[PDB]
Scaffold this active site. Structure first.
Site, PDB file in Angstrom:
ATOM      1  N   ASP A 281      38.047  41.261 -24.236  1.00 34.99           N
ATOM      2  CA  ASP A 281      37.586  41.394 -22.858  1.00 34.99           C
ATOM      3  C   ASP A 281      36.269  40.657 -22.654  1.00 34.99           C
ATOM      4  O   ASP A 281      35.200  41.184 -22.978  1.00 34.99           O
ATOM      5  CB  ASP A 281      37.410  42.876 -22.550  1.00 34.99           C
ATOM      6  CG  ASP A 281      36.947  43.137 -21.130  1.00 34.99           C
ATOM      7  OD1 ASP A 281      36.969  42.189 -20.321  1.00 34.99           O
ATOM      8  OD2 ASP A 281      36.589  44.298 -20.833  1.00 34.99           O
TER       9      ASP A 281
ATOM     10  N   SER B   4      32.826  27.973  -9.228  1.00 33.58           N
ATOM     11  CA  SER B   4      33.908  27.045  -8.949  1.00 33.58           C
ATOM     12  C   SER B   4      33.531  26.179  -7.747  1.00 33.58           C
ATOM     13  O   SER B   4      32.831  26.619  -6.839  1.00 33.58           O
ATOM     14  CB  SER B   4      35.201  27.819  -8.688  1.00 33.58           C
ATOM     15  OG  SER B   4      36.251  26.981  -8.253  1.00 33.58           O
TER      16      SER B   4
END
Length: 330
Positions: free
Chosen positions: A35, A199
């Site tokens: 994770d 992004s």
């Protein structure tokens, strides 16, 4: 040193991925959920409340000759999806894919929430976010990666998750045969303890690319892709009959649909998520309403590039002095 381990979807939807991890002496192999959105290595154990164990493999520290109680240490964690666990702490030898750390904090669960009990395939979590998020008190502990880092050939790990298939976590090296083209690296903020990056935009299907900054985290421990409501609406508007269902808890779409791809930007590069990666199947057995793999982050407080996004790429988690993230097509 290096390590390399195969990671395997837990079910036919890729709801999560499990990676075998050796703990203790002799080794006890548990299948952990790696994770990159958390920083605790915790396991079902001989200390876990019996009624809360349902098919998981447990760690028994009393059977490990290298286990030592970390005296006075406790831990307690709550995840973004409302699940939780807590307990005490041992140090022990932990190996992943041939890479060994001695004195790793292994957090033994005394209590786990229902979601964990109900998932028989996941024996615990191995956190790979920054150690500043580790919950051990009163002495915070380091992640497996942080402990291994100085010994690794290069201070990196990579995630190469499969679509409806196994993939690979590598530590300490970049497998140049595992991706196509070049890896584009992008800046990381560690201010919130995550692999947080920005992004450069998105496209839906064969549509034009929208240049827009989207801050979010690279999180292997989250199943879906959670993005701003504007972006998510633009995607689902291209699927006839798709709608956000308050009763179901997100966007659903007719199972008869063909889903468009979704592209996200990494610098000037582009990662394309095929439409099929966005299908999470019937909302309930036999239903013709299917659950979408792109959902709104509104009310989470952060955008999450979860498995839906990451499995479309070869992803480098570069833990150099100034961390960065790399993405390549594959």
């Amino acid at each position: 040193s290096t390590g390399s381990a195969t990671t395997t979807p837990i079910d036919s939807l890729d709801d999560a991925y499990i990676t075998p991890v050796q703990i203790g002496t002799p080794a006890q192999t548990l299948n952990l959920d790696f994770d990159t959105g958390s920083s605790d290595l915790w396991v079902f154990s001989s200390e876990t409340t019996a009624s809360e164990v349902d098919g998981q493999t447990i760690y028994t520290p009393s059977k490990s000759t290298t286990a030592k109680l970390l005296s006075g240490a406790t831990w307690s964690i709550s995840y973004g999806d409302g699940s939780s666990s807590s307990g005490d702490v041992y140090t022990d030898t932990v190996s992943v894919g041939g890479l060994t750390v001695t004195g790793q904090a292994v957090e033994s669960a005394k209590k786990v929430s229902s979601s964990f009990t109900e998932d028989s395939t996941i024996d615990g979590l191995l956190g790979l976010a920054f150690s500043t998020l580790n919950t051990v008190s009163p002495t915070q502990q380091k992640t497996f990666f942080d402990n291994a880092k100085a010994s690794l050939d290069s201070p990196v790990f990579t995630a190469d998750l499969g679509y409806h298939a196994p993939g690979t976590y590598n530590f300490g090296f970049i497998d140049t045969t595992a991706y196509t083209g070049s890896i584009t690296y992008t800046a990381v903020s560690t201010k919130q303890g995550f692999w947080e990056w920005t992004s450069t935009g998105y496209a839906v299907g064969s549509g034009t690319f929208k240049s827009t900054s989207i801050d979010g985290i690279a999180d292997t421990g989250t199943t879906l892709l959670y993005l701003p409501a504007t972006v998510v609406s633009a995607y689902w508007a291209q699927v006839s009959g798709a709608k956000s269902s308050s009763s179901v808890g997100g966007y659903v779409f007719p199972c008869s649909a063909t889903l468009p791809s979704f592209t996200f930007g990494v610098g000037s590069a582009r990662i394309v998520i095929p439409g099929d990666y966005i299908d999470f199947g019937p909302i309930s057995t036999g239903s013709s309403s299917c659950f979408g793999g792109i959902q709104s982050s509104a009310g989470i407080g952060i955008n999450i590039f979860g498995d839906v996004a990451l499995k479309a790429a070869f992803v480098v988690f570069n833990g150099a002095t100034t961390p960065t993230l790399g993405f390549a097509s594959k």
